[PDB]
């Protein structure tokens, strides 16, 4: 794979340096593969990034009892993200089933900006 | 910045193609900056990735009342990640204050592998 990338780059532009270039290309490919893996796990919902607490009452929010999961179910992933004010009751919002991290980033960008 | 990277790459190895190479370098730099931004936000704790539910009783786990937050506090981030079995009580584990995403990745890798 690094050889193909080096050949493509040389074609576009047109002994230990070649080894260093191949190592750099391999590191970049590994980083891109890590990004793709994180995006794929985000798509499957295996990244449980917490949705932000809405500012107003929403159908999503509810008590922790809204977090019902099966008795037989042995999932390691938390079903909801909850906050318990010293001022009131436990408020829980379910984690998105897909694109939880991307949805959180969109919510955070919308709120901050 | 792309010009410096192109010069460094040419030095290591030693008109529209130059523009395409500069655009590719700029895209790679933007992607690396996005990675650095995500890592930085992970360090500050602004990414609320849920820790996995422990298999045994742990000091971390507790009811939603363990999720106490200040009455004056108006934080948009959920304090805990909770699951409510149909079989028992609401179990809540606090989100790590720092490196929540990295800690979740470590926990997920340890559990899966």
């Amino acid at each position, epitope marked *: 794979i690094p050889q193909s990338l080096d050949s493509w780059w040389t074609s576009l532009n047109f002994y230990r340096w070649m080894a260093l270039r191949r190592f750099i290309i391999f590191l970049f490919i590994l980083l891109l593969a890590l990004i793709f893996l994180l995006v794929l796990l985000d798509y499957q919902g295996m990244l449980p990034v917490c949705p932000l607490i809405p500012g107003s009452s929403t159908t999503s929010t*509810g008590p922790c009892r809204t977090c019902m999961t099966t008795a037989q179910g042995t999932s390691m992933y938390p079903s909801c993200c909850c906050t318990k004010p010293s001022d*009131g009751n436990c408020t829980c919002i379910p984690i998105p089933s897909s694109w939880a991290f991307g949805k959180f980033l969109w919510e955070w960008a919308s709120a901050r900006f | 910045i792309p010009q410096s990277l192109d010069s460094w790459w040419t030095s290591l190895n030693f008109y529209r193609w130059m523009a395409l190479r500069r655009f590719i370098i700029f895209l790679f730099i933007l992607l690396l900056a996005l990675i650095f931004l995500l890592v930085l936000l992970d360090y500050q704790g602004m990414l609320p990735v849920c820790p996995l539910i422990p298999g045994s009783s742990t000091t971390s786990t507790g009811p939603c009342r363990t999720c106490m937050t200040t009455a004056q506090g108006t934080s948009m981030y959920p304090s805990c990640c909770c699951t409510k079995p149909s079989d028992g009580n609401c179990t809540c584990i606090p989100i790590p204050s720092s490196w929540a995403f990295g800690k979740f990745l470590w926990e997920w890798a340890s559990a899966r592998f």
Partner: antibody
Amino acid sequence: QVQLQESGPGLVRPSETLSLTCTVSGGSISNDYWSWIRQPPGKGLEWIGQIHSKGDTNYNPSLKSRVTISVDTSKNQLSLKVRSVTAADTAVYYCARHLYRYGYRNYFDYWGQGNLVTVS
Amino acid sequence: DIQMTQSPSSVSASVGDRVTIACRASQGISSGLAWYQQKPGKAPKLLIHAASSLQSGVPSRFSGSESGTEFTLTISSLQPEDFATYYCQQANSFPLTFGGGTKVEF
């Protein structure tokens, strides 16, 4: 704007079940915590109990578990049943929606008009 | 049960006066106190929540201070529509309890 309106009798006989209803218009009775608070005539407010549509209900221990609160999401209704009332149950009852400020709060921002029930 | 005491039981004030109403919790409520205003024959109106956060639409002349366990509601200028009964609620623990009510008179 959420509009709470109480309904029910005002001549509940002693040693009888006190039934009250609170119809919520202009909104949804789900998604919020709703409490019943009673005020005896000339006395202070006394919180009877809260309930959420998707959760459990909390009651005042001073009522000795003779009070049941329910939610009818189909009718947007909030029902209160105070069993075995005495002359002390003569009071104005309010259904109150709980404040929500980045989480459910135990404060009552919207109140019903209040229905006076006399036990005699 | 958190006992919620109010002081005084009645305040004799005129228009344009600095009116103070004190509330005290039997045990610390972590600034989980609210102030409600109730007029004769009307439902209470939530004035302040969390002992310092003014309610939306409430005039800014109302203020809430939380010095220790002793909370205070302050009215800078007592308008003629401000003569009512003021209740303090604790929200930290269940059951939620109100104060005895401070009736601000003429």
